[PDB]
Design a protein around this ligand. Sequence first.
Ligand code: S3M
Ligand code: CL
Ligand code: CL
Ligand code: CL
Ligand code: CL
Ligand code: MN
Length: 340
Amino acid sequence: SMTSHSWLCDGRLLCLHDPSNKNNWKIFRECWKQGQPVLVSGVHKKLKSELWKPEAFSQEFGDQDVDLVNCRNCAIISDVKVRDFWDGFEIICKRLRSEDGQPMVLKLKDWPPGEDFRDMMPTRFEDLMENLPLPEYTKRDGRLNLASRLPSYFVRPDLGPKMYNAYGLITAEDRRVGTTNLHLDVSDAVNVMVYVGIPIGEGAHDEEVLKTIDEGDADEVTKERIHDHKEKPGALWHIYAAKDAEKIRELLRKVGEEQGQENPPDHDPIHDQSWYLDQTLRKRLYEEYGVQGWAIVQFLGDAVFIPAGAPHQVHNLYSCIKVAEDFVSPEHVKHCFRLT
Ligand SMILES: Cn1nc(CO)cc1-c1ccccc1
Ligand SMILES: [Cl-]
Ligand SMILES: [Cl-]
Ligand SMILES: [Cl-]
Ligand SMILES: [Cl-]
Ligand SMILES: [Mn+2]
């Protein structure tokens, strides 16, 4: 039957079922005050689906100049066209090939550039902002968003939203690679999965996706959403509590040293955005430092709420279009304060 919510991560993750339920705040605010991420499903059913397709972005913006990133080695592909990314998003026979003749796994960098989303894409901007869940927290002028109400003693978010556009990781070797490496944000954010592209040509890449979720430590109920309801899984997240950030820095300093990196005792491996915690590193974090995380599979139309200060990493399973908006909740304003 229809229900207001359910739980993932063995009861540790709230999943809200109705993105426009005017009573969601009553369930949300207790989990949020405790420093937990939250998932909201069904946002895709509220959007104009024709605005969020890879073919539309190619047709409308394809002649713009852009840089790409190669996800396998972090190398920059300089001064190519927006269409060189979008036309290979699902059709593997159209992707830029590395010099080994394999199709590359690419990310579109800084697009739209800086704060230009609203000017470049006004119809998309309105469609996203009017359908965000928890609107008192997430709208630019929400009653519980302090972004526009704080003095310069607080770090304020840039004007959003921001897009995260990248191909899926494919091979067994790619299982230990990040789409986006471990980092943290001093603002809160909501990240919405607006499109999942399941490729063709080299399409039938279903079994390595299940091994990735299993080794990723996904709970048994999360595994039922694949096998039972057939929704499209986009990306595997690991999120850690803001309180655990220093213990994670202690682990990554120790591993940097073991691997022959030469680093001052105080350098910040989270701010560096150079690490992806693979199954080996995640087990070491739990066993050596006592730190547990949240393993989250983000399906089409899932909104992931990411607490200010919480370290997080993302591994795309298929090609994904995500759009995120920053906000400043009262529960987490301490994380952006510039003193003590
Ligand atoms: C309207 N609606 N739609 C869904 C999606 O499955 C869930 C609900 C919901 C809202 C309040 C109480 C119970 C359920
Ligand atoms: Cl907090
Ligand atoms: Cl638009
Ligand atoms: Cl709300
Ligand atoms: Cl990154
Ligand atoms: Mn982030």
